Structure 1
Amino acid sequence: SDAVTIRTRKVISNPLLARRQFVIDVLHPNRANVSKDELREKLAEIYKAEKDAVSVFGFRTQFGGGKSTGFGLIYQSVADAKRFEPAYRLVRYGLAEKVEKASRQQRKQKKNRDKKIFGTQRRAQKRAARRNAD
């Protein structure tokens, strides 16, 4: 039925990045798979760590189901985790907000448009305004 089983192998203690890192094996018979959010809750209880210090990613289910393999990180603190984590994983866990920027086309076009201006934008547009006597 349920009976989610978690195995950790290739465990490496990494004080250089203030974390412990390992491979995660999940046994979930009679279950499609286990969500990363649910694995993070289970992992926090097993190792008595804060939920926000646990990161899992890169999961794949074996052929026939019933088993998945991934990678996990456990930091010594949430502060250490927030420093040594990719932005996209913190957005996954809700620890950060997705930064809002224009498309790459818009950013590149704006960069090349500003390349035609020497000096301040205020000077350039005031002088351009003077030329167009309209």
Structure 2
Amino acid sequence: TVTIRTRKFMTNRLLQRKQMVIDVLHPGKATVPKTEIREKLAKMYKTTPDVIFVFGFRTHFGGGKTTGFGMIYDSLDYAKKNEPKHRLARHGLYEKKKTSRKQRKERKNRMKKVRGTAKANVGA
């Protein structure tokens, strides 16, 4: 019984995506996770359930309403091109090197201590 109504629909030919504001009605239950929102927007808009990228869902005080943002892309190449990396990591197609800032800064300073070919050697 979880319905979805759209709001502020506007499409971009220059971003190859359609931005809209999602209003989710889920009375009597908890906040619904984003993946059923992705399949329901895939069902209503007749699109594959992998180019829809939703975020920013805040539940109103009282329970029953949830307002959030969501985009519908044309294809996977456009979804890979102009997006932030963390949404792609949430959907599981991007991963970053597991190093902290302190190790990188210390390695940069230690590499700055020497010159030449040994700059790559001291950085391990």
TM over 0.5: yes
Superposed CA offset, 1:98-129 (max 9, x none)? 2123110000000011001111117987xxxx
The runs of at least 4 aligned residues of structure 1 exceeding 2 Å deviation read: 122-125
Deviates more, 1:116-125 or 1:41-50: 116-125
Deviation at residue 97 of structure 1 after TM alignment: 3.3
Hey, what does 2:11 align to over in structure 1? 13
Q: Find 1:116's aligned residue among 96, 105, 113.
A: 113
Deviation at residue 58 of structure 1 after TM alignment: 0.4
- The RMSD of aligned alpha carbons is 1.7
Query: In the alignment, is residue 39 of structure 1 matched against residue 49 of structure 2?
Result: no
* Structure 2 CA distance for partners of 1:119 and 1:49, relative to 1, 3 Å: same
Hey, what does 1:129 align to over in structure 2? none
Hey, what does 1:105 align to over in structure 2? 102
Q: Which blocks of at least 5 consecutive residues in structure 2 are unaligned?
A: none
Q: Which blocks of at least 5 consecutive residues in structure 1 are unaligned?
A: 126-134
Q: Find 1:62's aligned residue among 60, 63, 67.
A: 60
Size of the alignment, in residue pairs?
122
Counterpart AA for 2:112: K
- The two structures have a TM-score, normalised by structure 1, of 0.85
* Structure 2 CA distance for partners of 1:29 and 1:104, relative to 1, 3 Å: same
- The two structures have a TM-score, normalised by structure 2, of 0.92
Distance of 1:47 and 1:57 partners within structure 2: 18
Distance of 1:123 and 1:8 partners within structure 2: 53
Of the two, which has the highest radius of gyration? 1
Other structure's SS at 1:98 match: coil
Distance of 1:7 and 1:112 partners within structure 2: 54
Other structure's SS at 1:52 match: coil
Distance of 2:40 and 2:108 partners within structure 1: 47
Counterpart AA for 1:42: K
Distance of 2:108 and 2:47 partners within structure 1: 45
